[PDB]
Design a binder for this molecule. Structure first.
Ligand SMILES: *[C@@H]1O[C@H](CO)[C@@H](O[C@@H]2O[C@H](CO)[C@@H](O[C@@H]3O[C@H](CO)[C@@H](O)[C@H](O)[C@@H]3O)[C@H](O)[C@H]2NC(C)=O)[C@H](O)[C@H]1NC(C)=O
Ligand SMILES: *[C@@H]1O[C@H](CO)[C@@H](O[C@@H]2O[C@H](CO)[C@@H](O)[C@H](O)[C@H]2NC(C)=O)[C@H](O)[C@H]1NC(C)=O
Ligand SMILES: *[C@@H]1O[C@H](CO)[C@@H](O[C@@H]2O[C@H](CO)[C@@H](O)[C@H](O)[C@H]2NC(C)=O)[C@H](O)[C@H]1NC(C)=O
Ligand SMILES: *[C@@H]1O[C@H](CO)[C@@H](O[C@@H]2O[C@H](CO)[C@@H](O)[C@H](O)[C@H]2NC(C)=O)[C@H](O)[C@H]1NC(C)=O
Ligand SMILES: *[C@@H]1O[C@H](CO)[C@@H](O)[C@H](O)[C@H]1NC(C)=O
Ligand SMILES: *[C@@H]1O[C@H](CO)[C@@H](O)[C@H](O)[C@H]1NC(C)=O
Ligand SMILES: *[C@@H]1O[C@H](CO)[C@@H](O)[C@H](O)[C@H]1NC(C)=O
Ligand SMILES: *[C@@H]1O[C@H](CO)[C@@H](O)[C@H](O)[C@H]1NC(C)=O
Ligand SMILES: *[C@@H]1O[C@H](CO)[C@@H](O)[C@H](O)[C@H]1NC(C)=O
Lengths: 1274, 49
């Protein structure tokens, strides 16, 4: 029978070559197939003509045009055009612009101040190949959040670009992060730490069982310590182990740990310290899960206590005994007894042989036992003679044992494996099965899959050759295609046939494989399966070192085999900085996780639903015969379901879908250690040898790795190859990071002899003018120390001068005979003397102190200037003083994160719906003033906005009010706060979406009915929670809200309701100012904006001065907080009535500062800028703030500031800074780098500077002066 | 009204009678409000009034 078919993925990526295959099966005439993709609305249209021969599987690919909408749904209709017959079918497909996968490698995980940070960024596509993308920006965010450096609009040359940023001498100790915003927006972040430390010479190797059984007596545990070529070090270790019970509470102490079996001992040379600990002391029950194992290898002849909290991954699993499946069919048929394998596990992945199992089948009654063969396993098969859904459980050894009272005890659990296979709908009772082989398939090694076939009346036309086709898919697209031509005699009883499959790597971690036949009866029979493929790259790369060991040798080759032509990024660093903080995982598995669409299973269900065509299900509701039976839904499997599971749809002729549809150099000197080689090279046809000159500070092993990019074989990653470097006779020195100038400290120098012979040695410390060494032991007599020996010498050094001090120290093997040791071979070859020169810096004496000078300077299209004079007390220690200035257009920080999470779907009663609708106005308002806005969000917003308005209107009254419940019965009286709130937001709302003015006037009138001359406004109704308000339910705080909401509605100050509300607020202030017994702050901050907004600039400043005095300054961030001393409210409303009373009342003050009738003065707005700095910091991680009545006023206050500060047309903004004495520095702030902290130092001892600003748009100038004073009277 | 415990931890007092019928009298001391995290959860050590 003439049949055709076209398969295409349901998610087609735009501007990526998306393959789609065609099968035309029976001839008639020569036909032309043609797919045409076109838009749902609008005139966007395409066409790809596909070729098609008879009985074949010809394929074709195509790049799809871009869409402005991130994900757009479009119509795809295929059409078979032929002289005789003409077929066509439509379905909805989703297109998407799936952006690139990028990453950043850094020279180190951690940095020390002043050191330059080097990184490199790279971009690939779903095939891991270098992609020369244009990245619009990259920038380094400090721990406080300020963008410190940036690289704008650049293109990656070889699919990668290296960068460099020099860190400041005085940076912020903490964690930083480099971030790359792609063109789409997709911010790929990557961190690093910055802090002062002194690197460790030795690791602390902790060995603890990874997962330990509950039922246990004791356990083996051991700890060692090495550094280079595995030379151990001796020390007095102090290991511990303490478990933390499952506690869901802290309370001040917060120490969940309980039983503590601590230990102590000494480490053996050529070894460690080993120990067995009885686990019964822990009584691992009553919620016990994890437990840390701290260490403390204190190395002798060194005051060095290097710990290591290793194996904080030791576990106690409830599933002490376990079963699981391995290779079982999840799709079967009644005409072929199905097969399934099971495996036995005991807690920590142990297979146990020769132990009885109990299989149980709830269908064919297969309740049969068996015993676990070698490697704890049992395979079996069962008879197929039942109704479609078959449940198959397997329970082992202690199936049911010890049902203890699990209330106050651990449920002594045992997992159980189970599965439910369903049978496929057989058209002509013929079918195809695929033998399953689920297990990690290795790439670079071919696999073969077995296929079983059955023809019970399948023949029908009676032809010789029946074509069988197969496809493999990965990454959300078809990769490979093929065919096989099985030939049959008459009614082919059965048979077995296999198809080959090379595990290439062009297949991602999932490998969805289908197979299907094309019968002339107009039926399709097939099967589909999933195979896990190992995460592997195509560019096979391997790193090595020509030498190994040596000492400060020269020319040590470093070799990289890779693709014939590839750019390879190398990285070599001392395994001490790597020991310190492990570098961010960069492996094959790291890259595969970076890939979007790891697997495509099912159509894109949430946005699209192409699940319909005809309901012939309910057409027939007749009789069976022996007693009437009306139709009802099913759960059987078909060919459509296997294509849906694959994630591709199909346009076809033949019977594919089921019936139903209605139911849903330097001699001997040492220095230079941090990062040995950060570089890149190009591989010749084979590999490439890099001749790196060896480093001299080689007290440790040099671990080094790399990666490659090739146009053909994708990307690769090398196995971290190491290089030791050990001089048999050397000296080390224990010393801090920094020291104080005046105060003396203790420097140590530790000499070592790993050479077999024994030597006697002297300790020379060449003094300099910068310090004064005073040895702790006076005799400088040489003392014998033999193989695996050591001697230390502590000197009391006091630094004289300040800054960097480069010390000098020597040690020579003395040939003095008449020796303590039984022999005297002191003279070695040429290792005989080694001199070390390791510096450490010094800081100035006393107590440090700092001053700060912030000032918002805004030239209104002209120029403004301010003068800065830096004074210093007479007690400053010389050269201890230092200073610098910063420049920026800041409000674009919170503005990144916050914007996203807010704007939700409106729902609930009158109280709840407002919580979701009310923010949506102020977010829309804030997004508009910042300039950062999108029409795809404005539309998504207005929908949640217009809906919430109409939903809120549903809880109004005839009198104009609005109640928590509303009026389903109408047994309520609108609450005065909820009405006032509605009105304040219906005043705002009215600006974007147009509102019915009657609702506001109706409300306004009702508010006036509950207005008393004295005490202004009265409380009316009840409230479910006091969460929707920072109002302290006082007549003063309530009227203080209604009065803002009323003035915020444009109303004159001469209005009779406001005239009798303002009268009440003057009386409320004059008394709340006088008597401290009454008010405190929430009120003070509301009285501020209310006055400002009303126009009493005199009363405004009167309350604002006593507010400003009562404020809480901090690190240049002024704000306000409810004074916590009086009391602590209820356990539910303790966090909003204080933290949110803080974070609303502050943004209330901010509005009062911003709200001056002529315009806010430079003195008003510069003080307002400080308040912005605190509120913007104090932001809710997900977005928004603590309560709701703070989230609202925060955004309203921010946007109102944002209006005053920002400029649209003001692109240019110029800023000069000079000093009386020839100093000069300038900057330029413009539309793109307003989001960058431009900083510069200042050289003057007595500061006399001038800040000059020009052009348009504001600039914030923060000057910080630091010094150190030593006065004391004790 | 506050007062202080005399010798043998004790305080006697009287109050004015001018209100409705049922008169509720509670006596709180030292620290009524405190933060023992949650009420019920894992451990309570209330100080009875
Ligand atoms: C929300 O954002 C819009 C912009 O999307 C803001 O509108 C802009 O506001 C300024 C004044 O604040 C307008 O400038 C003036 O325009 C008139 C012409 O209509 C001209 O005669 C004046 O000389 C002056 O340039 C600006 O044109 C206007 N539109 C745009 C597209 O920028 C609006 O202020 C924001 N706020 C709210 C609450 O809507
Ligand atoms: C296993 O499957 C076979 C299918 O071949 C079953 O054999 C049939 O059993 C019925 C009796 O119940 C006979 O009438 C048929 O003639 C048998 N067919 C053949 C080809 O022998 C067998 O009974 C099943 N056994 C179990 C335990 O399920
Ligand atoms: C401490 O001494 C060392 C060793 O002399 C100085 O380090 C470098 O010395 C070489 C000598 O040829 C110079 O060419 C380098 O420029 C020096 N390094 C740097 C970073 O300048 C080191 O400078 C000395 N420290 C001080 C503070 O004088
Ligand atoms: C107990 O009650 C008395 C009287 O009501 C309070 O006494 C006043 O305390 C302040 C200082 O806190 C003094 O300045 C006044 O002279 C006191 N007398 C009056 C009549 O106000 C006392 O504070 C209360 N105790 C506590 C712990 O608050
Ligand atoms: C082609 O298909 C049409 C419709 O099924 C039929 O009329 C015709 O007989 C077929 N065969 C040939 C040889 O044209
Ligand atoms: C746009 O629509 C017109 C008809 O109004 C049609 O002639 C034209 O082909 C369409 N454009 C594209 C690009 O398909
Ligand atoms: C643990 O130590 C004991 C000796 O105390 C030893 O018999 C056992 O093999 C060790 N465990 C393992 C898994 O090596
Ligand atoms: C396992 O099955 C066989 C045969 O049905 C039976 O002889 C044996 O007793 C069974 N094993 C157990 C543990 O009962
Ligand atoms: C109530 O009696 C008390 C006795 O201590 C007295 O101090 C108070 O003034 C009286 N007040 C009234 C309203 O009678």
């Amino acid at each position: 029978k003439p049949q055709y078919m076209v398969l295409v993925p349901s998610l087609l990526h735009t501007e990526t070559t998306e393959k789609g295959c065609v099968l035309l099966s029976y001839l008639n005439e020569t036909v032309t197939v043609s797919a045409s993709l076109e838009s749902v609305r609008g005139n966007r249209s395409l066409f790809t003509d596909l070729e098609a021969e008879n009985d074949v599987l010809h394929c074709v690919a195509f790049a799809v045009p871009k869409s402005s909408s991130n994900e757009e749904v479009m119509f795809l209709t295929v059409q078979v055009k032929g002289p005789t017959q003409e077929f066509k079918k439509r379905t909805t497909v989703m297109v998407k612009n799936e952006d690139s996968l990028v990453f950043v490698q850094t020279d180190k995980s951690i940095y020390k101040p002043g050191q330059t940070v080097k990184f490199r960024v790279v971009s690939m596509d779903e095939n891991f190949h270098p992609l020369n993308e244009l990245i619009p920006l990259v920038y380094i965010q400090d721990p406080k959040g300020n963008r410190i450096a940036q690289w704008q609009s650049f293109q990656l040359e070889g699919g990668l670009k290296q960068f460099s940023f020099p860190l400041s001498s005085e940076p912020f100790q903490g964690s930083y992060k480099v971030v790359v915003q792609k063109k789409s927006g997709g911010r790929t972040e990557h961190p690093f730490t910055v802090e002062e430390f002194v690197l460790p010479k030795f690791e602390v190797q902790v060995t603890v069982p990874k997962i330990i059984t509950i039922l246990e007596e004791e356990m083996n545990v051991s700890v060692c310590g090495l550094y280079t070529y595995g030379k151990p070090v001796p020390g007095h270790v102090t290991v511990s182990i303490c478990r933390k019970y499952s506690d869901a509470s802290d309370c001040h102490g917060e120490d969940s740990q309980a039983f503590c079996e601590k230990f102590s001992g000494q480490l053996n040379s050529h070894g460690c310290f080993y120990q067995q600990v009885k686990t019964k002391v822990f009584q691992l029950k009553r919620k016990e899960y994890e437990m840390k194992l701290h260490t403390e290898a204190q190395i002798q002849e060194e005051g060095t206590v290097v710990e290591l909290t290793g194996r904080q991954s030791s576990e106690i699993t409830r599933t002490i005994t376990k079963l699981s499946f391995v290779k079982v069919d999840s799709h079967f048929r009644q005409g072929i007894p199905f097969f399934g394998q099971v495996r036995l596990v005991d807690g920590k992945g142990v297979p146990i042989p020769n132990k009885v199992i109990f299989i149980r089948g709830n269908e064919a009654n297969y309740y049969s036992n068996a015993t676990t063969d070698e490697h704890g396993l049992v395979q079996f098969s069962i008879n197929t003679t039942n109704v479609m859904g078959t449940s198959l459980t397997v329970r082992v050894n202690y199936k049911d044992r010890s049902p203890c009272y699990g209330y106050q005890w651990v449920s002594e659990e045992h997992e159980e494996a189970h599965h439910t296979a369903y049978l496929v709908f057989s058209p002509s009772k013929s079918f195809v099965h695929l033998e399953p082989m689920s297990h990690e398939l290795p790439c670079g090694h071919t696999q073969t899959v077995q296929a079983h076939y059955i023809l019970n009346g399948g023949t029908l036309l009676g032809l010789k050759k029946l074509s069988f086709y197969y496809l493999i898919m990965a990454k959300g697209g078809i990769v490979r295609t093929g065919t096989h031509g099985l030939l049959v005699k008459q009614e082919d009883m059965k048979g077995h046939f296999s198809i080959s499959i090379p595990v290439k790597s062009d297949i991602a971690p999932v490998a969805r494989l289908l197979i299907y036949a094309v019968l002339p009866t107009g039926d399709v029979i097939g099967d589909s399966a999933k195979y896990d493929v190992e995460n592997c790259l195509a560019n096979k790369v391997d790193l090595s070192f020509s030498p190994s060991q040596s000492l400060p040798a020269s020319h040590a080759h470093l070799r990289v085999t890779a693709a014939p032509q590839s750019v390879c990024a190398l990285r070599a660093v001392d395994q001490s900085v790597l020991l310190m903080k492990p570098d961010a995982e960069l492996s094959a598995s790291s890259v595969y996780n970076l890939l979007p669409e790891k697997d495509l299973t099912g159509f894109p269900g949430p946005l699209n639903d192409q699940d319909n065509e005809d309901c012939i299900n309910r057409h027939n509701v007749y009789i069976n015969g022996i007693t009437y039976t009306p139709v009802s839904s099913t759960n059987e499997k078909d060919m459509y379901s296997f294509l849906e599971d694959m994630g591709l749809k199909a346009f076809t002729n033949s019977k594919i879908r089921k019936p139903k549809m209605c139911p849903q150099t330097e001699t001997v000197r040492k220095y230079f250690p941090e990062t040995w080689i950060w570089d890149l090279v190009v591989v010749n046809s084979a590999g490439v040898a890099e001749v790196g000159v060896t480093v001299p500070d080689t007290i440790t092993e040099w671990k080094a790795g790399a990666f490659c990019l090739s146009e053909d074989a994708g990307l690769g990653i090398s196995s971290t190859a190491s290089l030791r470097a050990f001089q048999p006779f050397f000296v080390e020195l224990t010393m801090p990071y920094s020291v104080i100038r005046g105060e003396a400290f203790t420097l140590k120098a530790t000499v070592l002899n790993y050479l077999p012979k024994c030597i006697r040695v002297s300790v020379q410390l060449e003094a300099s003018p910068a310090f004064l060494a005073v040895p702790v032991e006076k005799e400088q007599a040489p003392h014998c120390i033999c193989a695996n020996g050591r001697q230390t010498v502590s000197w009391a050094v006091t630094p004289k001068s300040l800054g960097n001090v480069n010390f000098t120290v020597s040690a020579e093997a003395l040939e003095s005979q008449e020796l303590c040791g039984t022999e005297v071979p002191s003279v070695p070859e040429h290792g005989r003397k080694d001199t070390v020169i390791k510096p450490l810096l010094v800081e100035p004496e006393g107590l440090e102190k700092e001053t700060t000078f912030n000032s918002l300077l805004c030239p209104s299209g002209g120029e403004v200037s301010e003068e800065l004079s830096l004074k210093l007390p007479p007690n400053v220690v010389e050269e201890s003083a230092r200073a610098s200035v910063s420049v920026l257009g800041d409000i674009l920080g919170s503005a990144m994160q916050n914007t996203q999470n807010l704007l939700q779907m409106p729902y609930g009663c009158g109280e709840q719906n407002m919580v979701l609708f009310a923010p949506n106005i102020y977010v829309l308002d804030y997004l508009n003033e910042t300039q950062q806005l999108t029409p795809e969000i404005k539309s998504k917003a207005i929908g949640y906005l217009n809906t919430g308005y109409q939903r809120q209107l549903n809880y109004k009254h005839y009198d104009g009010s609005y109640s928590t419940f509303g009026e389903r019965y109408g047994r309520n009286q609108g609450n005065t706060w909820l009405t006032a709130f509605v009105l304040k937001t219906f005043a705002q709302a009215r600006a974007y979406i147009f509102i019915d003015e009657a609702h506001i006037t109706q409300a306004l009138i009702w508010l006036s009915q509950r207005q008393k001359d004295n005490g202004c406004f009265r409380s009316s109704g009840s409230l479910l929670n006091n969460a929707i308000k920072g109002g302290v339910e006082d007549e003063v705080t309530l009227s203080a809200y209604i009065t803002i909401a009323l003035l915020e509605i444009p109303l004159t100050v001469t209005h009779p309701v406001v005239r009798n509300a303002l009268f009440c607020l003057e009386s409320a202030w004059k008394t709340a100012q006088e008597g401290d017994h009454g008010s405190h702050v929430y009120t003070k901050a509301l009285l501020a904006y209310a006055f400002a907004l009303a126009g009493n600039q005199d009363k405004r400043k009167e309350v604002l001065k006593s507010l400003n005095e009562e404020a809480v300054k901090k690190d240049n961030s002024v704000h306000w907080e409810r004074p916590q001393k009086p009391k602590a409210p209820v356990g539910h409303f303790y966090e909003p009535q204080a933290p949110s009373a803080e974070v609303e009342m502050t943004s209330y003050v901010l509005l009062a500062y911003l709200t001056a009738q002529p315009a806010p003065t430079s003195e008003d707005l510069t003080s307002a800028t400080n308040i912005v700095k605190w509120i913007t910091k104090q932001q809710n991680a997900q977005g928004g703030f603590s309560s709701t009545q703070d989230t609202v006023v925060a955004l309203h206050a921010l946007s109102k500031y944002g209006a005053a500060t920002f400029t649209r047309t003001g692109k240019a903004a110029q800023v000069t800074i000079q000093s009386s004495g020839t100093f000069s520095s300038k900057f330029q702030v413009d539309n793109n780098n307003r989001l960058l902290l431009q900083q510069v130092s200042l050289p003057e001892l007595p500061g006399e500077y001038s800040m000059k600003v020009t052009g348009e748009g504001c600039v914030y100038l923060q000057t910080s002066l630091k010094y150190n004073i030593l006065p004391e009277k004790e």
